[PDB]
Amino acid sequence: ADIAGLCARTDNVRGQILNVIKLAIEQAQRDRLYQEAINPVTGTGGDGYVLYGDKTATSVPSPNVRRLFNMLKTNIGRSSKYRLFELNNAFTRSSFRTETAQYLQGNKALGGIYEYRVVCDTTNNTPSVIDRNEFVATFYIQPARSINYITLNFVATA
Amino acid sequence: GYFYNSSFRRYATLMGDLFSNIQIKRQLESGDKFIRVPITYASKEHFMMKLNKWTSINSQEDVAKVETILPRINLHLVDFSYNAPVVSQYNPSPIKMIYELSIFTRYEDDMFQIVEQILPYFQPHFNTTMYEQFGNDIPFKRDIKIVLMSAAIDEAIDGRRRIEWSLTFEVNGWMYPPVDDAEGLIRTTYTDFHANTRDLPDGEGVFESVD
Amino acid sequence: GYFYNSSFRRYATLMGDLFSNIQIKRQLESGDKFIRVPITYASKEHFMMKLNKWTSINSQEDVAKVETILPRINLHLVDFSYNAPVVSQYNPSPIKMIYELSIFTRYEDDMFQIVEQILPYFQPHFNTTMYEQFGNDIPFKRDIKIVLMSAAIDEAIDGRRRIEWSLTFEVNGWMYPPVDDAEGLIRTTYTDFHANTRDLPDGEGVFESVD
């Protein structure tokens, strides 16, 4: 219940918790718990702090990184309302692309995403050809602290 | 029998069409008659030749028929040059085109009416946003500035005969290499003298044929 | 039977060849026909005299063969001067050369097609890198700026008859004393309107003979 609010906080949705006065438990086990993808709390010299950032993660690279991606994906999908507004064309590739790109670029400028290449990190649903189809937003984004680009695809289509 | 997507053609038709819909009031006994001024696109020399040909009384049926020919307007391109402020075509090239708009009239009153319908909309310039859509893509937005450059007043007598006033206009427009008509016909709209968005009629619709 | 390595000759051919490959679309029932516009190099007056000789309707075999003559382009040098920014020849002298490119046409549409294929590439200037290799030595790199200076529109009537538009071009090039053809033939390449590195054809290939 607590750590969840501790997320609404730090980055987008691990730094001592507020009103604790004792934890049920406070190295081998800790390393074991990590990897297990479990969120531990440890107390050192008094005051307990979050050992690790979180998640019961699975097939992805081991890497905060998640929140960046989850947030982007969630926001991108909402922009789907726009699709109903207009028709799909080459131009629609632009426009939608420009809109999302502006959002993505902002993330980079603020910091949070790095090495974002508008050229080949954006969307073309159809294979690069004259032919095209509805647009799905696929993006390769890299969280600032991690040398890995992750591919995420969200689709707006029939 | 013509390159439909011609940039020159589009500017000729745009210009022709801003001035296509001009009428003069002509008071009759039965009541007021409003007559539309017919517009042609032709070299001035050419137009004047054919105009002397139409206005010639060869037979008796000509006598009446002859006073319907005037008033009219002839339009022509007379100059163009690069318009000084990676590949080229939307992004396209700022060009500047010079048009002679020539009003001919048998009566000072006719002239006054017509020109009063042209002149006030150029202070000294008249802006218009033009939209050219390719097949089905997002239309392109070309900002077209038309500037009234100068005017010229003259006659040509015989006993009435014929008044000629010419306006010179600078269109600040856009050029790019030809896009084949086979690649799809360009769709064009624009804002008229009242910012009302008409769409560009085909050439054949605006200009009466000098031929 | 001509000084092959003539610098004036090279520039005449460079200019002629940039404009060697211009076609107009001409719609037929069987299908669209594309016709290449033939280019000549001649003093303008000369070209026009001979053009009046070809355009004269002498017989019935002449009547048809009339619309194969137009459209055409005539090219000529009309002025040159030093181009104010140990011995002299590569390192050579900055010269400036003035060319009149005269387009003649029976139909406004023809003109529109042609000029639309020229005009957008001069804003107001068009760059081309030229490579001139001597025998087998390392090539020389001459940067050539061609500037569109002005255009001039005219007619010449008889009942249609003939539309004439003339472009004037400033080539910012390079002059040096003649290098004998016997010392080895010059190899020349250049970048066309699309940065495509074509190699400069011999004179005899670009210009049709006015003679």
Question: Domains in chain C, please, with CATH?
Answer: 2-211 (3.30.2000.40)
Cross-chain Cβ contact C124/B84 below 8 Å = yes
- Residue written as token pair 């890995």: A148
Which residue of chain C is at minimal alpha-carbon distance from B77? C153
Chain C interface includes B89 (CB < 8 A):
yes
First to last CA, chain C: 15
Resolution at which this structure was determined, Å: 15.0
- Breaks in chain A (C to N > 2.5 A) come right after 13, 26, 63
Judged by DSSP in three states, C116 sits in helix
What whole-number distance in Å separates Cα of residue A9 and Cα of residue A29? 28
Cross-chain Cβ contact B7/C151 below 8 Å = no
Which residue of chain A is at minimal alpha-carbon distance from B133? A91
Long-range contacts of the stretch C115-118 (C-beta < 8 A, 24+): C115/B8, C115/C165, C115/C167, C116/B3, C116/B6, C116/B7, C116/B8, C116/B175, C116/B177, C116/B178, C117/B177, C117/B178, C117/C22, C118/C19, C118/C22, C118/C167
What whole-number distance in Å separates Cα of residue A60 and Cα of residue C111? 63
Kindly list the partner chains of chain C, i.e. chains with 3 or more CB atom pairs below 8 Å: B
Count the neighbouring beta carbons within 10 Å of the beta carbon of residue B200.
Answer: 20
Chain C, 101-130: which have a CB under 8 Å from a chain B CB?
A: 109, 112-113, 115-117, 119-124
Which residues in C50-73 are b (16+ Cβ under 10 Å) and which e? ebeeebeeeeeeeeeeeeeebbbb
What whole-number distance in Å separates Cα of residue A74 and Cα of residue C29? 57
Give me the phi and psi of C98, to 5 degrees please: -110, 120
Q: What is the CA radius of gyration of chain B?
A: 19
Judged by DSSP in three states, B74 sits in strand
Query: Residues B152, B165: contact at Cβ < 8 Å?
Result: yes
- The C-alpha torsion from A9 through A11 and A13 to A14, rounded to 10°, is -70
A91 interaction partners in chain B (CB closer than 8 Å): 137-138
What whole-number distance in Å separates Cα of residue A90 and Cα of residue A134? 10
Nearest CA to C206 out of C4, C1, C65, C21 is that of C21
What whole-number distance in Å separates Cα of residue A153 and Cα of residue B119? 58
Chain B interface includes C56 (CB < 8 A):
no
- Residue written as token pair 């647009």: A135
What whole-number distance in Å separates Cα of residue B21 and Cα of residue A102? 45
Q: Dig out the tokens for C195 from the structure.
A: 């940065």
Distance of CA C24 to the CA centre of its chain: 17
Cross-chain Cβ contact C116/B89 below 8 Å = no
- Residue written as token pair 């050992």: A51
- With an 8 Å CB cutoff and a minimum of 3 pairs, decide whether chains B and A touch: yes
What whole-number distance in Å separates Cα of residue C126 and Cα of residue C145? 6
Chain B, 124-143: which have a CB under 8 Å from a chain A CB?
A: 136-138
Residue type, C198: R
B95 interaction partners in chain C (CB closer than 8 Å): 119
Kindly list the partner chains of chain A, i.e. chains with 3 or more CB atom pairs below 8 Å: B
Distances (CA, A) of B200 to A72, B4, B192: 44, 12, 10
What whole-number distance in Å separates Cα of residue B23 and Cα of residue B35? 5
Residue type, B128: T
C32 interaction partners in chain B (CB closer than 8 Å): 182
What whole-number distance in Å separates Cα of residue B211 and Cα of residue C29? 23
Query: Residues A3, A39: contact at Cβ < 8 Å?
Result: yes
Cross-chain Cβ contact B137/A95 below 8 Å = no
Kindly list the partner chains of chain B, i.e. chains with 3 or more CB atom pairs below 8 Å: A, C
What whole-number distance in Å separates Cα of residue C205 and Cα of residue B139? 43
Query: Residues B9, B2: contact at Cβ < 8 Å?
Result: yes
Query: Residues A134, A156: contact at Cβ < 8 Å?
Result: yes
What whole-number distance in Å separates Cα of residue B31 and Cα of residue B15? 32
First to last CA, chain B: 15
What whole-number distance in Å separates Cα of residue B142 and Cα of residue B77? 20
Cross-chain Cβ contact C157/B2 below 8 Å = no
Burial class (CB in 10 A: 0-12, 13-18, 19+), B179: buried
Of C113, C116, C155, the CB nearest to B43: C155
Q: How far is B143 from chain A (nearest CA, A)?
A: 19
